[PDB]
């Protein structure tokens, strides 16, 4: 059926291990790899197969999975913090690069057969 609400042909990526970030603070390092049961484990994305670069998917992947995510709590369940937000954006990130290097070869052939 839908993903989350109307993506625009995105999908969902495999749930992996969610990456510890460094922000530069003692804080928000510890907030972040103490409630990061909280924060997602997959990421949304478009067919990288159409992306003539690796920095343009990372953008969407990133904005769009936060988009997903915190747009479906936010505004629909719970209203996030902007640090919730930002640390997520940079799992997000170190997530996005790892499913990149998957997708990319990955739909070379799954979605070419």
Known sequence: GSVVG???????????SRPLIHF???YEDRYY????????????????SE??????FVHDCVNI?????TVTTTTKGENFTETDVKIMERVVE?????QYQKEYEAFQQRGAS
Do not use: F, W
């Open 6 to 16: 109307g993506l625009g042909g995105y999908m969902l990526g495999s749930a992996m």
């Open 65 to 69: 999975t936060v988009k997903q995510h």
């Open 94 to 98: 170190q997530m996005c690069i790892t």
């Open 33 to 48: 790899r103490e409630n990061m049961y909280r924060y997602p484990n997959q990421v949304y994305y478009r067919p990288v």
């Open 51 to 56: 992306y003539s670069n690796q920095k343009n």
């Open 24 to 26: 530069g603070n003692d």
